[PDB]
Design a protein around this ligand. Structure first.
Ligand code: OGA
Ligand code: MG
Ligand code: NI
Ligand code: ZN
Length: 331
């Protein structure tokens, strides 16, 4: 078996290898990459997402989210308070203000120490889940607005035509903005490109060990667990690397820099934080190997997780027994 310790793998495709997206994903999996839950892909040196980022300031963040924490430094939840609309130029100025800017630090490890010590004492503002793309239409390779759709994959593998669409989303971050422990909707893959700015640190649990993370989360968030049988779908819970180590949970970490892609694999729990002002683009995708994960994915039926129009069809076709109860949650 390849990559039996489930380490995060880093790939450096040539421009020739960067032509065929599906083929490269299948290659990475042939080397065991999926066992980690997360891989990094450094694009060929000749490739670019677009010519410049000079003209993005007028993108609107219609509903910036203030991420307010509760709990202890290593075990906390966050709630998202809605704020008034602002442009990306206005958000960048806010991220760079004395109140929100990255503190002085020695290196990424020192900054990670400072994040886990101090995150709960601040409420950074995140622009999340903004439908759109920053890839130039002329970028033909690994353009996250031009991928094969999940509805087309399901149709190709299973023969069933379904409604729904698959588009990318933009993320504008600042120091301490946080993504909670989660897998993707329907345990899909994700791909994330860091277009510009400061890094993003990721933590990930190997898919084969995801249930260990779930059992710890039920112990650490016991009222949330009683409220919902898949409460990590709410995307609110954080657990630090120190707490994971104290409880024997297998995980890995890596820092993504501007210009780099990350891929998350089916049922790879992940969480992380931004180092300073940045912009990322991400989308879900599927492969043939995903189908069985989609059939087994947990679902939130308490009604908190509330997700896209296109997830309906996935549940209806892959999980017809759950359909009924999951849609009672979504209506
Ligand atoms: O970058 C972010 O805030 C969160 N993104 C992801 O969870 C992803 O790409 O799967
Ligand atoms: Mg603009
Ligand atoms: Ni994700
Ligand atoms: Zn729920």
């Amino acid at each position: 078996a390849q990559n039996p310790n489930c380490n995060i793998m880093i790939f450096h495709p040539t421009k020739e290898e960067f032509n065929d997206f599906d083929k490269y994903i299948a290659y990475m999996e042939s080397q065991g990459a999926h066992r980690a839950g997360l891989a990094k892909i450094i694009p060929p040196k000749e490739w670019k997402a677009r010519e410049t980022y000079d003209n993005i300031s007028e993108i609107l963040i219609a509903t910036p989210l203030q991420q307010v924490a509760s709990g202890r430094a290593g075990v906390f939840t966050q709630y998202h308070k809605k704020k008034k609309a602002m442009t990306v130029g206005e958000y960048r100025h806010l991220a760079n203000s004395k109140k929100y800017q990255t503190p002085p630090h020695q290196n990424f490890e020192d900054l990670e120490r400072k994040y886990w010590k101090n995150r709960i004492y601040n409420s950074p503002i995140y622009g999340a889940d903004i439908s759109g793309s920053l890839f130039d239409e002329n970028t033909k390779q690994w353009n996250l607005g031009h991928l094969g759709t999940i509805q087309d994959l399901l149709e190709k593998e299973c023969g069933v035509v379904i409604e729904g669409v698959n588009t990318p989303y933009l993320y504008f971050g600042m120091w301490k903005t946080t993504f909670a422990w989660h897998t993707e909707d329907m345990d899909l893959y994700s791909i994330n490109y860091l277009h510009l700015g400061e890094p993003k640190t990721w933590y990930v649990v190997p898919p084969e060990h995801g249930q260990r993370l779930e059992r710890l989360a039920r112990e650490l968030f016991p009222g949330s667990s009683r409220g919902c049988g898949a409460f990590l779908r709410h995307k609110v819970a954080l657990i630090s690397p120190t707490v994971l180590k104290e409880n024997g949970i297998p995980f890995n970490r890596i820092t993504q820099e501007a210009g780099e892609f990350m891929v998350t694999f089916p049922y790879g729990y992940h969480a992380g934080f931004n180092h300073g002002f940045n912009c990322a683009e991400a989308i879900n995708f599927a492969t043939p190997r995903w189908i069985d994960y989609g059939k087994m994915a947990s679902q939130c039926s308490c009604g908190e997780a509330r997700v896209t129009f296109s997830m309906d069809a996935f549940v209806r076709i892959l999980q017809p027994e759950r359909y009924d109860l999951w849609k009672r949650g979504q209506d």
